[PDB]
Amino acid sequence: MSKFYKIWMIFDPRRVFVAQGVFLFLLAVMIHLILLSTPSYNWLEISAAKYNRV
Amino acid sequence: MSKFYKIWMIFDPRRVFVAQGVFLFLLAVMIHLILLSTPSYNWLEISAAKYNRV
Amino acid sequence: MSKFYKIWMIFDPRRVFVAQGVFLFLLAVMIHLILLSTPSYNWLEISAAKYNRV
Amino acid sequence: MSKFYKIWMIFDPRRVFVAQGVFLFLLAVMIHLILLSTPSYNWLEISAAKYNRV
Amino acid sequence: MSKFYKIWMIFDPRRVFVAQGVFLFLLAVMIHLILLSTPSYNWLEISAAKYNRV
Amino acid sequence: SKFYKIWMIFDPRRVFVAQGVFLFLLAVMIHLILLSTPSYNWLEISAAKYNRV
Amino acid sequence: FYKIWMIFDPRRVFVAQGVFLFLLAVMIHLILLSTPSYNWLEISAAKYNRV
Amino acid sequence: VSEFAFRLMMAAVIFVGVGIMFAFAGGHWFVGLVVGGLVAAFFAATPN
Amino acid sequence: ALLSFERKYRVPGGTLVGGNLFDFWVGPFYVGFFGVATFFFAALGIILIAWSAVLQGTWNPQLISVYPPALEYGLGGAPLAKGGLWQIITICATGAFVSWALREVEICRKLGIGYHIPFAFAFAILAYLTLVLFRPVMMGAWGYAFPYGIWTHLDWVSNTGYTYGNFHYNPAHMIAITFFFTNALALALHGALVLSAANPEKGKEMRTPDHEDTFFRDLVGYSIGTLGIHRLGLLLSLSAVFFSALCMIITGTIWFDQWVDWWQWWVKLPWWANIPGGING
Amino acid sequence: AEYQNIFTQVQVRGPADLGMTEDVNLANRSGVGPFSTLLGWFGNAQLGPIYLGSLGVLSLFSGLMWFFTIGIWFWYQAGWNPAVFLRDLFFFSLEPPAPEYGLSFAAPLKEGGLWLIASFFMFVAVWSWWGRTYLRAQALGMGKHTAWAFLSAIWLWMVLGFIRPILMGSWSEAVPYGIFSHLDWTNNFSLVHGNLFYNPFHGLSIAFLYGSALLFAMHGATILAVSRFGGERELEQIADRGTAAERAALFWRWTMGFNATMEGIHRWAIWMAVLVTLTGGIGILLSGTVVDNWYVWGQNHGMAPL
Amino acid sequence: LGYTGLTDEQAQELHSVYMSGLWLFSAVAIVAHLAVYIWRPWF
Amino acid sequence: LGYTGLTDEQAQELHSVYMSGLWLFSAVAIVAHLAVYIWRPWF
Amino acid sequence: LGYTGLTDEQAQELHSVYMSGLWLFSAVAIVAHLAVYIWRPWF
Amino acid sequence: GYTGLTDEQAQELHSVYMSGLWLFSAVAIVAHLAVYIWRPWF
Amino acid sequence: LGYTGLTDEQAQELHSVYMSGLWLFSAVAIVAHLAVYIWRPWF
Amino acid sequence: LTDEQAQELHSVYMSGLWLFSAVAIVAHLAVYIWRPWF
Amino acid sequence: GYTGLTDEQAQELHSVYMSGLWLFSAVAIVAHLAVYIWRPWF
Numbered sequence A, B, C, D, E: 001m002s003k004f005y006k007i008w009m010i011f012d013p014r015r016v017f018v019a020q021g022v023f024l025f026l027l028a029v030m031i032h033l034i035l036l037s038t039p040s041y042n043w044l045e046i047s048a049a050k051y052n053r054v
Numbered sequence F: 001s002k003f004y005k006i007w008m009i010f011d012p013r014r015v016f017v018a019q020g021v022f023l024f025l026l027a028v029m030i031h032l033i034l035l036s037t038p039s040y041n042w043l044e045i046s047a048a049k050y051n052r053v
Numbered sequence G: 001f002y003k004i005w006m007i008f009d010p011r012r013v014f015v016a017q018g019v020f021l022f023l024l025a026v027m028i029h030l031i032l033l034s035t036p037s038y039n040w041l042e043i044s045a046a047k048y049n050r051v
Numbered sequence H: 001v002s003e004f005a006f007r008l009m010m011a012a013v014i015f016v017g018v019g020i021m022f023a024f025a026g027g028h029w030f031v032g033l034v035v036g037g038l039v040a041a042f043f044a045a046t047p048n
Numbered sequence I: 001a002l003l004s005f006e007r008k009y010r011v012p013g014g015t016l017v018g019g020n021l022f023d024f025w026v027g028p029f030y031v032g033f034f035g036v037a038t039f040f041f042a043a044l045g046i047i048l049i050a051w052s053a054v055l056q057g058t059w060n061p062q063l064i065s066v067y068p069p070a071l072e073y074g075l076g077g078a079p080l081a082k083g084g085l086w087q088i089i090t091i092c093a094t095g096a097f098v099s100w101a102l103r104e105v106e107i108c109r110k111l112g113i114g115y116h117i118p119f120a121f122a123f124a125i126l127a128y129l130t131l132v133l134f135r136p137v138m139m140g141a142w143g144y145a146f147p148y149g150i151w152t153h154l155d156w157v158s159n160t161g162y163t164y165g166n167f168h169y170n171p172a173h174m175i176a177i178t179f180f181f182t183n184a185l186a187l188a189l190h191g192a193l194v195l196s197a198a199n200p201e202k203g204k205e206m207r208t209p210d211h212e213d214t215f216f217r218d219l220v221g222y223s224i225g226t227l228g229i230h231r232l233g234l235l236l237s238l239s240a241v242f243f244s245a246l247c248m249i250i251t252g253t254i255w256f257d258q259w260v261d262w263w264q265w266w267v268k269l270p271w272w273a274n275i276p277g278g279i280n281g
Numbered sequence J: 001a002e003y004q005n006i007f008t009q010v011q012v013r014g015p016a017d018l019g020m021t022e023d024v025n026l027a028n029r030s031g032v033g034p035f036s037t038l039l040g041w042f043g044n045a046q047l048g049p050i051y052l053g054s055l056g057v058l059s060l061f062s063g064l065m066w067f068f069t070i071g072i073w074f075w076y077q078a079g080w081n082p083a084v085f086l087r088d089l090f091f092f093s094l095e096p097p098a099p100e101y102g103l104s105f106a107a108p109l110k111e112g113g114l115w116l117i118a119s120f121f122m123f124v125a126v127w128s129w130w131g132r133t134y135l136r137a138q139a140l141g142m143g144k145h146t147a148w149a150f151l152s153a154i155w156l157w158m159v160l161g162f163i164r165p166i167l168m169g170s171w172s173e174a175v176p177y178g179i180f181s182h183l184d185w186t187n188n189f190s191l192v193h194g195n196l197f198y199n200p201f202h203g204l205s206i207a208f209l210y211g212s213a214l215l216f217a218m219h220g221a222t223i224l225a226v227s228r229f230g231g232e233r234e235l236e237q238i239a240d241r242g243t244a245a246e247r248a249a250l251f252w253r254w255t256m257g258f259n260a261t262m263e264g265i266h267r268w269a270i271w272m273a274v275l276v277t278l279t280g281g282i283g284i285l286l287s288g289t290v291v292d293n294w295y296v297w298g299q300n301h302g303m304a305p306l
Numbered sequence K, L, M, O: 001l002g003y004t005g006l007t008d009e010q011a012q013e014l015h016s017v018y019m020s021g022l023w024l025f026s027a028v029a030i031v032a033h034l035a036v037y038i039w040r041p042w043f
Numbered sequence N, Q: 001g002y003t004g005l006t007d008e009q010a011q012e013l014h015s016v017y018m019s020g021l022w023l024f025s026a027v028a029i030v031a032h033l034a035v036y037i038w039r040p041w042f
Numbered sequence P: 001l002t003d004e005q006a007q008e009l010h011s012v013y014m015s016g017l018w019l020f021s022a023v024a025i026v027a028h029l030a031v032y033i034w035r036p037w038f
C-alpha cells in the first residue's frame, strides 16, 4: 500500500497525468449525461416539474 | 497542500495554460448550450414568455 | 494579480493577440447568431412588426 | 508457486501496465453496461420504481 | 513427458504468452456469451424470475 | 517410425503454430456441430431433463 | 516418381497435400452429415428415440 | 512463383475451405467468412 | 518543333507492328500503326455522333444522344436509326481505346520506360467494357448499356441506380467510393506537399524530401515516402475503378432487390438478432 | 518476370529520423514510434514523431469531444446494450433538430440539441486543425499549399453542415452523424431537389473527381515507369532535371501533344483535387437556396428535352 | 530565463497597453449591455 | 524531475499567481452560481 | 527499471503530492456523493 | 531478463504488483458482497 | 534445442513456473465448475 | 535434391502414405459394416 | 539437415512430439469413452 512511489520511477509523469485527466473528464461527462438520460435523475427536468416551469 | 508548485517544473507553462484555456472554453460553451437546450432554463425564451414576446 | 504582467514572458505576444482576436470575433458572431435565431431578440423582425411594416 | 517475479524478465512493465489498465477499465465498463441493459439490474430505474419517481 | 520444457527453447516466451492471453480471454468471453444466449442459463433471467423482479 | 526426417526440413515453430490453430479450429468445429444438433445440445438436454424452460 | 522431390519444392508439396487432404476429408464428412442416411448423429437420435 | 505468391494462393484456398466448413458448422456464412479471413490473413502475413 | 531536349530520344524502334511504315511524328504526336488505327476509329466515332445528331434532329451539344438498341433486340444487331449507330460507335470507341493503349505501349518501348501507363489505362477500358459489354451480355440485352449523350447517360445512371433502390447500399459501391474519395484526398495532399517543398515561404531555400517527410510527420505522425505516395495513388485509382466495375458486375446479376436489405444479414445475427431495443430491435 | 516497382523487395532500417527544424519548437515534438514492416513493404516503415502545439491540442480535444458525444448518444440509442451497440452501429444517428425548431438553439437535448453540441465540437476541431496545418507549414518555411487544399474540403464541409442550414433557416437541412443516416441524407437531398445530376456544379464536381482519379493513375503510373531513372525524387528532378523528367515529359508529349513538368504536374494535381470540393460546395449551396428542381432547371437551360 | 525572450519592463509596458485596451473594450461592452437591457431585458 | 529545470523561486511565483487567477475565477463563478440559483434554483 | 529517469526521492515526493491530490479529489467526491444520495438515493 | 531486470528488482516489482492486485481484489470482494446483499443473482 | 538462445536450466525453470501458473488456473477452473454444477447441473 | 536424399524422402513418404491408407481402409470397411452404400 | 536440425536433435524433437501426441491421445480416448458411456452414438 504505502509503496506506490515505484510506479512513477518507470512511467512518465507528464503522459500519466494528461491521460488520467482526460480519462477522468470523459468518465465524468459520460456519467453526467447518463444521469441526464434517465428521467428519474434529470435534475433539470425534476426542477422543472417541481416548480411548474412547463 | 503546499507542494503543488513544482508541477510547473514538470509541466511546460505554455502547454498547460493553453490546455486549461481550451478546456474551460469548451466546457463553458457546452454547459451554456445545455442550458439553452432545456426549455425550463433557456433565458431568451423564458423572458419571451414572461414579457409576452413572440 | 498586480503581477499578471509576466505571463507575457511565457507566451508569445503575437500568438496571444491573434488567438484572442479570432476568439473575440467568433464569440461575437456566435452570440449575434443566437440572438438572431430566437424570435424574441431578432431585432429586424421586432422593428418590422412594432413599426407595422410586415 | 509464488515465483512469478521473473515474468517481468519476459514482459516489460511498459506494455504490461497499460494493457492491464485498458483491459480492466474495458471489463468494468462492459459489465456496467450489461447491468444497465437488463431491466432487472438497472439500478437507477429500480430506485425510481421503489421511490415512485416516474 | 519431462521433455516438454524444451518447447520454451523453440518458442518465444513473450509471443507465446501474448497469444495465450488473448486466446484465453477471447475463449472465456465466447463461452460466457454462449451461456448467456440460452434463457435456460442466462443467470440474470433466472434470478429475476425466481425473485420476481420483472 | 522413420518419420523424424519430417523434422529435418520443416521449421518446428510454424509447424507447432499451425498445429495449434488447426486443433483449435477442429475442436470448435466439433463443438459447434454438436450444439447445432438438437439431439446433442447438452444445454437443452439438461433444460428438458431438469424441467427448466 | 523419384524426380518429383527435385522439380517440385518439398515444402510446397507437403503443404499442398496436407491442406488438400484436410479440406477433402471435411468436405466428404459434410456431405455425409447433410444426407439423412449417413448422418450418425441423426441416425443414433432416431435409433434410441433420443431426439 | 515466389514464396509469397504460393503462400497467397494457399491462403486463398484455405480461407475458402475453412470458411465453408465453419459456415456449415457455425450456423451462418458470416462466422465462416470471419474465421477464414482471420486464419488466411495470419497465414499470409507470416513469411517463410 | 521539338522540346529543347527531345532530339536525343527521337530514335527508331519499339514499335509492335510495322517498324518503319508508321514510325514518324506528326507535330508532337507519335503516329504508329495504332496511331493510324486510333485516329481512324476516333474520327469515325465523332462523325457518326454528328450524323446521329442530324438524325435526332438536334444541334444542341448537350441534347445530342445516341441510344443503344431496345431490350427487344437482346444481344443482336439493330438498324442504324434504332440502335445500330450506337453499336458501330461502340465498336469505334473500343477500337480507339485499345489502339490508344497499344500506341502508348509503343511509346513506352521507344522511351525505355515501364508499362504502368497503358496498364492503368486498360483498367479504365475494362470498366467501360463492363458497362457496355460485360453487364449487358450477362444480362442479355444491349439496351442495358448507356447512351452516348452528355446528359442522357446520366439518365441511364440514375435509372439503373434506382432500379435497385438506393445504390448507396451496394457494398462494392461503398469501397469504390471510399477509394475514389481517398484518392482525391491523396492527390490533394501530394500536390500540396510537393508544391510547398518546391516553393518555400518567401525568398528562401528550396526544401528537401526530408523536409516534407518532416511536415507530414508533424501533421499526422506519418509519411509514406515519395515512392510510396505514387504507389498509393496508382493503387487507389486502379482499385477504385476495379471495385466500380465490381459493383456494377454483381448488380442485376447476383443481387436483384433493394441493396439496403443486404445490411439486414448483420442485424439478424442470431446472438443479437432478437434483442429488444435499438434502431432495429 | 519483370519487376514493376509496386512493392519494395528489400527493406532497410537505420537510425530514427527525428526530422529537421527550421523554426520548429522542439518541445512539442514527440519521439519516434515503432516500425511497421508490413506498412514498410509499401513505404516508410517509421512512425512518429508527432508535433502537438496549441492549435493541435485544441483540435485533438475538440475532436475527442465530438466523437465521444456521438458515441454516448449512440450508446443511449442502444439502450446501453453493447450487443445492440455492435448490431445497430451503422443505423445509429445523432440527427439534427426537426424543422419546426428552425435555427433555434431552444431544442431539447434528445431532440437535436446534442447535435448542436457535437457540431460545435467538430467545427472547433476542424478549424483548429486547419490552423494547425498552416502553422506546421509556417514552422518549416514551406508554402501554405496544404492549408488551402484543406480549406477547399473545409468549405464543402461548412456548406453541408453550417452555411446551407443557416441560409435555409433550419438545422433540419444539415447532415446527421450516422453511417447510413448520412447516406440516406445524400439520396434524399438528391430526390428532394429533383435529380441533382442536373446540377451543373454537381456535374463539374464529378468531372474533377473523375479527373483526380484519372490524373493520379496517370501520374503514379508515370513516376513508377520512370522510377528506374530516379523518378521518385521529384524535388531533385525539379532542381536538377534528369532523364526521368525528360522521358516522362516526352511520353505525354508524344501521346497527348502536350506535357507537364516535374513541378507543374503537381499544380495540375492540387487544382484538380481542390476543384472537386469547390464546385461541390457551390452546387450544394445553390440547391434549395436558388434552385429547388434541377431537372426543370436543366430543361430551361438546354441540358434536357422539353 | 523565460521562453519568449522578453524582459520584465517591456512585459510591464505591454501588459499596461493590453490592459488599457481590454478595459476600453469591456467598458464599451458594458455600455452596450446596459443600453440593450434597458431596451429589452432578458430577466 | 527537472524536465524544464525551472528554478524553485520561479515555480513558486508562477504557482502563486496562477492560484491567484484561479481563485479569482472560482470566486466570480461562485457569485454567478449564487445569482443563477437565486433567480431560478434547480434544487 | 527506472525507465523515465526519476529517482527514488523524486518518485517519493511526486507520489506524496499526487496522493494528496487524490485524497483531496476523493474527499470532494465523497461529500458530493453524500449530498446527491441525500437528495435522491439510488439504493 | 529481457528488459534488464535483476532478481532483486524483479522480486520487488512482483511483490508490489501483487500487493496492488490483492488491494484491488479486496475492494472487488467488498463490492461483490455488497451488491449480492442488495440484489442476489442466484 | 535453440532458436531462442536459452539454456537448459532456463527452459526448465520457465516451464516449472509456467506449469505452477497453469495448475493454479486449472484448480480455480475446477472449483468454479463444481460450484456451477452444484448450483445448476448441466448433466 | 540429391538423388539419395530424394529417394529416401520418397521412401519415407510412401511408408507414411501406406500407413495412412491402411488406416483409412480399415475405417472404410468398418463403415461398410455399419451401413452398405453399394 | 537443411533446417538446422541434426539427427540427434531430430530424434529428440520427434520423440518429444510423439510423447505429447500420445498424452493427448490418452486424454482424447478417455473423453470419447466418457461421452460414449453417457450416451452411445453408434
Ligand code: BCL
Binding pocket: F015, F018, F022, F030, G013, G014, G015, G017, G018, G019, G021, G022, G025, G026, G029, G038, G040, P020, P021, P023, P024, P025, P027, P028, P031
Ligand atoms: C459414420 C462414419 C464415421 C466416419 C467416416 C470416416 C471415413 C470413411 C474416414 C474417416 C476419417 C477420419 N475421421 Mg471419421 N467418421 C465419422 C465421423 C467423424 C467425426 C465426428 C465429428 O463425428 C470426427 C471428428 C471424425 C474424424 C476422423 C479423422 C480421425 C479421420 C480423418 C483424418 C484427416 O482428415 O486427416 C487430414 C488432416 C491432416 C493430414 C492434418 C495436416 C494438414 C494440415 C491442416 C495442413 C498441412 C500443413 C502441414 C505442415 C503438413 C505436414 C504434413 C503433410 C501431410 C505433409 N470422423 C463417423 C464416426 N471417417 C478418414 C480416415 O480414416 O483417415 C485415415 C476416412 O477415410
Ligand code: BCL
Binding pocket: I157, I181, I184, J126, J153, J154, J156, J157, J160, J185, J186, J187, J189, J190, J195, J196, J197, J201, J202, J205, J206, J207, J209, J276, J277, J279, J280, J281, J283, J284
Ligand atoms: C442519389 C445521390 C445523388 C448524389 C447526391 C450528392 C450530394 C448531396 C452530394 C453529392 C456530392 C458529390 N457527388 Mg454526388 N450524387 C449522385 C451521384 C454521383 C455519382 C454517380 C456516378 O452517380 C458520382 C461519381 C458522384 C460524385 C459526387 C462527388 C463529385 C461529390 C462529392 C465530393 C466529395 O468528395 O466530398 C467528400 C468530402 C467531404 C464531404 C468533406 C470532408 C472533409 C472535411 C474536412 C471532413 C473532416 C473529417 C473529420 C475531421 C474527421 C473524419 C472522421 C474520421 C475519418 C473518422 N455523385 C446522385 C445523383 N452527391 C457532394 C457535392 O458536393 O456535390 C455537389 C454532395 O454534397
Ligand SMILES: CC[C@H]1c2cc3[nH]c4c(c3C)C(=O)[C@H](C(=O)OC)c4c3nc(cc4[nH]c(cc(n2)[C@@H]1C)c(C(C)=O)c4C)[C@@H](C)[C@@H]3CCC(=O)OC/C=C(\C)CCC[C@H](C)CCC[C@H](C)CCCC(C)C
Binding pocket: I038, I041, I042, I043, I044, I045, I046, I089, I092, I093, I096, I097, I100, I104, I117, I118, I120, I121, I123, I124, I147, I148, I149, I150, I151, I153, I237, I238, I241, J210, J213, J214, J215, J217, J218, J221, J255, J256
Ligand atoms: C483507370 C483509372 C482512371 C483512368 C486512367 C487513365 N485514363 C487514361 C489513361 C489512364 C492511365 C491514359 O493513359 C489515357 C490518356 O491518354 O490520358 C490522357 C487515358 C484517357 N482517359 C481519358 C478519359 C477519361 N478517363 C476516365 C477515367 C479514368 N481514367 C479512371 C478513373 C474518364 C471518366 C471517368 O469519364 C474519362 C472521360 C482520355 C483523356 C484518355 C484516352 C483517350 C483516348 O481514348 O484516345 C482515343 C480516343 C479518342 C481521342 C476519342 C474517341 C472518341 C470515340 C471514338 C467516340 C465517342 C465514344 C464515346 C463512347 C462517347 C460517350 C459520350 C458520353 C458518355 C458523354
Ligand SMILES: CC[C@H]1c2cc3[nH]c4c(c3C)C(=O)[C@H](C(=O)OC)c4c3nc(cc4[nH]c(cc(n2)[C@@H]1C)c(C(C)=O)c4C)[C@@H](C)[C@@H]3CCC(=O)OC/C=C(\C)CCC[C@H](C)CCC[C@H](C)CCCC(C)C
Binding pocket: I181, I182, I184, I185, I188, I189, I192, I219, I220, J050, J059, J060, J062, J063, J064, J066, J067, J122, J125, J126, J129, J130, J133, J146, J147, J149, J150, J151, J152, J153, J273, J274, J276, J277
Ligand atoms: C480536395 C478535397 C479532398 C480532401 C482534401 C484534404 N483533406 C484533408 C486535407 C486535404 C487537403 C488536409 O490537409 C487534412 C489532413 O490533415 O490530411 C491528412 C485533411 C483531412 N481530411 C480528413 C478526412 C476526410 N477527407 C475527406 C475528403 C476530401 N479531403 C476530399 C476528397 C473525407 C471524406 C471523403 O469524407 C474524409 C473523411 C482527415 C484525415 C483530415 C482532417 C483531420 C482533422 O481535421 O482532424 C480533426 C479531428 C477530429 C474532428 C476527430 C479526431 C478523432 C480522434 C480519434 C481524436 C483522438 C485522438 C487520440 C487522442 C490520439 C492519440 C495519439 C497518441 C497515442 C500518440
Ligand SMILES: COC1=C(OC)C(=O)C(C/C=C(\C)CC/C=C(\C)CC/C=C(\C)CC/C=C(/C)CC/C=C(\C)CC/C=C(\C)CC/C=C(\C)CC/C=C(\C)CC/C=C(\C)CCC=C(C)C)=C(C)C1=O
Binding pocket: I026, I029, I030, I031, I035, I036, I038, I039, I040, I042, J214, J215, J218, J219, J220, J222, J223, J245, J248, J249, J252, J255, J256, J257, J258, J259, J260, J261, J262, J265, J268
Ligand atoms: C511528372 O511526370 C508527368 C508529366 O510531365 C513530366 C506529365 O506531363 C504528365 C501528363 C499530365 C498533364 C499534362 C496534365 C494535364 C492532363 C490531363 C488533365 C489529363 C487529361 C488530358 C486531356 C483530355 C488532353 C487531351 C487528350 C487527348 C486524348 C487528345 C489527344 C489528341 C489526339 C486524338 C490526336 C492524336 C493523333 C494521332 C494518333 C496521329 C494520327 C496520324 C495519322 C492518322 C496520320 C496523319 C494525320 C493527320 C495529318 C491529321 C492532322 C494532324 C494530327 C494528327 C493532329 C492535329 C489535328 C487534328 C484534327 C486533331 C504526367 C501525368 C506526369 O506525371
Ligand SMILES: COC(C)(C)C/C=C/C(C)=C/C=C/C(C)=C/C=C/C(C)=C/C=C/C=C(C)/C=C/C=C(\C)CC/C=C(\C)CCC=C(C)C
Binding pocket: A024, A027, A030, A031, A034, B003, B004, B005, B006, B007, B008, B009, B010, D025, D028, D029, D032, D033, L001, M010, M013, M014, M015, M017, M018, M021, M022, M025
Ligand atoms: C457506464 O458505466 C458507468 C460509468 C455508469 C460505470 C462505470 C464506471 C467505471 C468503469 C469507473 C472507473 C473508475 C476509475 C478507474 C476511477 C479511477 C480514478 C482515479 C485513480 C482517480 C485519481 C485521480 C487523481 C487525481 C485527481 C490527482 C490529482 C493531482 C493533482 C491535481 C496535483 C497535481 C500534481 C502534482 C502537483 C505533482 C507534483 C509532483 C511533482 C514531482 C511535480
Ligand SMILES: COC(C)(C)C/C=C/C(C)=C/C=C/C(C)=C/C=C/C(C)=C/C=C/C=C(C)/C=C/C=C(\C)CC/C=C(\C)CCC=C(C)C
Binding pocket: A025, A028, A029, A030, A032, A033, B020, B027, B030, B031, B034, C003, C004, C005, C006, C007, C008, C009, C010, L010, L013, L014, L017, L018, L019, L020, L021, L022, L025
Ligand atoms: C456533460 O457533462 C456536464 C456538462 C453535464 C457536467 C460535467 C461537468 C464536468 C465534468 C466539469 C469539470 C470541471 C472541471 C474539471 C473544472 C476544472 C477547472 C479548473 C482546474 C480551472 C482552473 C483554472 C485556472 C485558471 C483560470 C488560472 C488563471 C491564471 C491566470 C489568468 C494568470 C496566468 C498568469 C501567470 C500564471 C503569470 C505567469 C508568468 C510567469 C513569468 C511564470
Ligand SMILES: COC(C)(C)C/C=C/C(C)=C/C=C/C(C)=C/C=C/C(C)=C/C=C/C=C(C)/C=C/C=C(\C)CC/C=C(\C)CCC=C(C)C
Binding pocket: D003, D004, D005, D006, D007, D009, D010, E020, E024, E027, E030, E031, E034, F024, F027, F028, F029, F031, F032, F035, O013, O014, O015, O017, O018, O020, O021, O022, O025
Ligand atoms: C465453439 O466451441 C465451444 C466454445 C462451444 C466449446 C469449445 C471449446 C474449446 C475448443 C476450448 C479450448 C480450450 C483450450 C485449448 C484450453 C486450453 C487452456 C490452457 C492449456 C491454458 C493454459 C494456461 C496457462 C496459464 C494461464 C499460465 C499462466 C502462468 C502464470 C500465471 C505464471 C507466470 C509465468 C511465468 C513467470 C513464466 C516463467 C518464466 C520464468 C523466467 C520463470
Ligand SMILES: COC(C)(C)C/C=C/C(C)=C/C=C/C(C)=C/C=C/C(C)=C/C=C/C=C(C)/C=C/C=C(\C)CC/C=C(\C)CCC=C(C)C
Binding pocket: E003, E004, E006, E007, E008, E009, E010, F016, F026, F029, F030, F033, G022, G025, G026, G029, G030, G033, O001, Q012, Q013, Q014, Q016, Q017, Q019, Q020, Q021, Q024
Ligand atoms: C463434419 O465432420 C467433421 C469434419 C467434424 C469430422 C472430420 C474430422 C477430421 C477431418 C478430423 C481430423 C483429425 C486429425 C487429422 C487429427 C490429427 C491430430 C493430431 C496429429 C494431433 C497431434 C497432437 C500432438 C500434440 C498435441 C503434441 C503436443 C506436444 C507437447 C504438448 C509437447 C510440447 C513440446 C514441443 C511442442 C516440442 C518440444 C521441443 C523440443 C526442443 C523437443
Ligand SMILES: COC(C)(C)C/C=C/C(C)=C/C=C/C(C)=C/C=C/C(C)=C/C=C\C=C(C)\C=C\C=C(/C)CC/C=C(\C)CCC=C(C)C
Binding pocket: C030, J067, J068, J070, J071, J072, J074, J075, J116, J117, J119, J120, J122, J123, J157, J158, J159, J160, J161, J162, J175, J176, J177, J178, J179, J182
Ligand atoms: C465505444 O464508443 C465510444 C463511445 C467509446 C466512442 C465511439 C463513437 C462512435 C461510434 C462514433 C461514431 C461516429 C460517426 C459514425 C460519425 C459519422 C459522421 C458523419 C458520417 C458525418 C458526415 C457529415 C457531417 C457533416 C457534414 C458535419 C458538418 C458539421 C459542420 C460543418 C459544423 C456544424 C456547426 C454548427 C451546426 C454550428 C456550431 C455552432 C454552435 C454555436 C453550436
Ligand SMILES: CCCCCCCCCCCCO[C@@H]1O[C@H](CO)[C@@H](O[C@H]2O[C@H](CO)[C@@H](O)[C@H](O)[C@H]2O)[C@H](O)[C@H]1O
Binding pocket: F036, H015, H016, H018, H019, H020, H023, H024, H025, H026, H027, H028, H029, H032, H033, H036
Ligand atoms: C467462403 C466462406 C463462406 C462460405 C459460404 C458458402 C455459402 C454457404 C455455405 C453453407 C450453406 C449451408 O450451411 C448451412 O445451411 C443451413 C441451411 O438450413 C443453415 O443452418 C440453419 O438451418 C439448419 C437446418 O437446415 C439448422 O440446423 C441450423 O441451426 C441453422 O443455422 C446455415 O446456413 C448453415 O448451417
